[PDB]
């Protein structure tokens, strides 16, 4: 029940556990399938993109399952697709705790995990243990994405991503080159035109070298804090290299006027409601700059069917959410899907596909 989780369970749980502990428990419970029984996906929610079928367009954003420990439990939660990561080549602990903060009054979160990761090797074996099961899930419209990061002390960023492509690329439907984390020094500078072109050329060559059935689509995840110039350059490089898609957006280092949370000034990436429209507008811009020819996964502040549809109409073929789950719990997934379907009908769309980029055509 949506009300029970939102009004009693989640609030109570958050009053007993600090945010990081709550997240750990969340991963455990999800991996064990301890979830409230979930909404029947209708044909209207089906979407075909990135060379795959997605039974519904709502996925779990990177960061919740960083090490690929609860993939099956997440599909059970109702997500149309799952994205794990970010995963770094070698294992690393990330930043010291506390590194995640709740801003209840803003329905937001600020985190500075710093790419805490079990590493490629561990995640590789974890995914291989269910590789064939995933193959059937994917064929049944439930794709898997793998988000790649880089180690804090890496001297060659491009090689870190290349290694991720070689090790986890064969186990993913799509790979995400995450160059938008605000918690790794100098990482976002990789979004620059020159560095991005060099980086992505290497990533794509590595990807193309994989055997056909193990060749994933490659997407780039960008920040919501890019200048107009940065966006023009990214769009240019994407079209030049044939990048398969974009994930828009990661968390923001900005602090919108109006934040009420006592922890609003903590260093880190802000997620949730305060990021919603900044992300939607970034999706709108990237869609236009790419002439609607580059698939976009919209992410940032999605907690309702309306939030999802606004991003879809802005140009997103798929959407993801994370923060909303931390406030409303598992039931939010079914809620978003139910509201989205109803809105699609009310607005005269035959299905999700018909609504993609609709705002640009009116
Ligand atoms: O809650 C938090 O403060 C934060 C996070 C979080 O993962 N929160 C969740 C949580 F604490 C849970 F218990 C969740 C779950 C996960 C699965 C089942 C659940 O129902 C229960 F507890 F009754 F079993 C609740 C969940 F999905 C979260 F996102 C991530 C950053 C901060
Ligand atoms: C606690 C936390 C950890 C995250 N970790 C990652 C990560 O490792 N890689 C990544 O690409 N994004 C990461 N993100 C960002 C989310 O994938 C997403 O882009 C962003 O939070 C906006 O969506 P939301 O408002 O629904 O949370 C993280 C977000 C949070 C809140
Ligand atoms: O691990 C992290 O701190 C992190 C990575 C990322 O891409 N985004 C985010 O908000 N946090």
From Swiss-Prot:
GO biological process: 'de novo' pyrimidine nucleobase biosynthetic process; 'de novo' UMP biosynthetic process; pyrimidine ribonucleotide biosynthetic process; UDP biosynthetic process
Enzyme class: oxidoreductase
GO molecular-function term, one example from the UniProt record: dihydroorotate dehydrogenase (quinone) activity
Top-level taxon of origin: Eukaryota
Active site per database record: 181
Reaction catalyzed: (S)-dihydroorotate + a quinone = orotate + a quinol
Pathway the protein acts in: Pyrimidine metabolism; UMP biosynthesis via de novo pathway; orotate from (S)-dihydroorotate (quinone route): step 1/1
Pfam families per record: DHO_dh (PF01180)
Known cofactor(s): FMN
Residues annotated as binding FMN: 62-66, 86, 147, 178, 221, 249, 272, 301, 322-323
Annotated cofactor note: Binds 1 FMN per subunit.
InterPro entries in UniProt: Aldolase_TIM, DHO_dehydrogenase, Dihydroorotate_DH_2, Dihydroorotate_DH_cat, Dihydroorotate_DH_CS
Additional remark text: The identification of DHODH defects as the cause of postaxial acrofacial dysostosis (POADS) was obtained via exome sequencing, demonstrating that this method is a powerful tool for identifying genes underlying rare Mendelian disorders. Exome sequencing consists of targeted resequencing of all protein-coding subsequences, which requires around 5% as much sequencing as a whole human genome.
Subunit structure: Monomer.
Name the record gives this protein: Dihydroorotate dehydrogenase (quinone), mitochondrial
Primary gene name: DHODH
